[PDB]
Amino acid sequence: GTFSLPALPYAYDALEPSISAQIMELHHSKHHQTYVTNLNNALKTYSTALAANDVPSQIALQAAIKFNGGGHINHSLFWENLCPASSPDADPASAPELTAEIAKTWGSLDKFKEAMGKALLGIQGSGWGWLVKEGSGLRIVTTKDQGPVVGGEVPVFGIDMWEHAYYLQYLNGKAAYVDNIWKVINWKTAEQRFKGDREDAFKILKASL
């Protein structure tokens, strides 16, 4: 249980005006931090419950590990696939192979953005939207709460649709949040994940879910 909060690749105000400095600070230093802290605590306590043959605690702590582990994975991925709007990495030309495949699948990048926006706005309750790479092709999938993408689904990029991700700035207007987050998507990161050029940093953690 020695997981740590990652440093952001940028300052808390670096994604303005798409995402406010207050949201970024809270989202990282409070929400993500709490997932890390509670993940570590559940993992250590789980080791005690296993040795004690305490089946009720094992079941409860496994659920806590899945929730907080998913929160750690998802937010870690999220920071990496965001960048300042002025960065060259926010230009989809940074992702030639990914955008070529997107066009073959949805017709165009704009048509893909429309489809993913509808999926994001359709999530009931808290959750995430993902572009994932499967052997059978690219696909848009959503997960509830802190469910991570696992198995044969390789995450290309994710967008957080929990209300804490946008409410202070956009209020109930989650559509405006989604419209603006496209400006700060790190297409360089998405390309690297699509091509398989980044090792999976959470391979071990996924084994504990």
Annotated binding site for Fe(3+): 27, 75, 160, 164
Contact 101, 138 (CB under 8 A): yes
Q: Which does 160 bind (CB under 5 to 8 A by kind): Fe ion, a copy of itself, none?
A: Fe ion
Single-letter amino acid code for the residue at 94: S
**Is 20 near a copy of itself (CB under 8 A)?**
no
Q: Tell which positions 106-125 bind a copy of itself, by CB under 8 A.
A: 106-107, 111, 118-119, 121-122, 124-125
Q: What is the DSSP letter of 29?
A: I
Contact 156, 190 (CB under 8 A): yes
Task: Give whichever of 187 and 202 is closer to a copy of itself, judged by the CB atom.
Answer: 202
Single-letter amino acid code for the residue at 209: L
User: Annotated binding site: which residue ranges?
Assistant: 27, 75, 160, 164
Applying CB under 8 A, which part among 8-16, 58-66, 80-88, 184-192 lies near a copy of itself? 58-66
39: left (phi over 0), alpha (psi -120 to 50) or beta: alpha
Residue with the two structure tokens 């699509």:
194
Task: Give whichever of 41 and 87 is closer to a copy of itself, judged by the CB atom.
Answer: 41
Task: Give whichever of 40 and 87 is closer to a copy of itself, judged by the CB atom.
Answer: 40
| Least distance (Å) between residue 94 CB and a copy of itself | 19
Q: Which does 146 bind (CB under 5 to 8 A by kind): Fe ion, a copy of itself, none?
A: a copy of itself
Contact 159, 175 (CB under 8 A): no
**How many residues form the binding site for a copy of itself (CB under 8 A)?**
74
Applying CB under 8 A, which part among 11-19, 27-35, 81-89, 178-186 lies near a copy of itself? 27-35
Contact 149, 129 (CB under 8 A): no
First to last CA, the chain: 13
Long-range CB contacts (within 8 A, 24+) of 29-33: 29/5, 31/71, 31/75, 31/164, 32/5, 32/71, 32/72, 32/75, 32/76, 33/5
Q: Which does 106 bind (CB under 5 to 8 A by kind): Fe ion, a copy of itself, none?
A: a copy of itself
Q: Tell which positions 122-181 bind a copy of itself, by CB under 8 A.
A: 122, 124-127, 130, 132, 134-139, 141-153, 162-164, 167-168, 171-172
Task: Give whichever of 164 and 198 is closer to Fe ion, judged by the CB atom.
Answer: 164
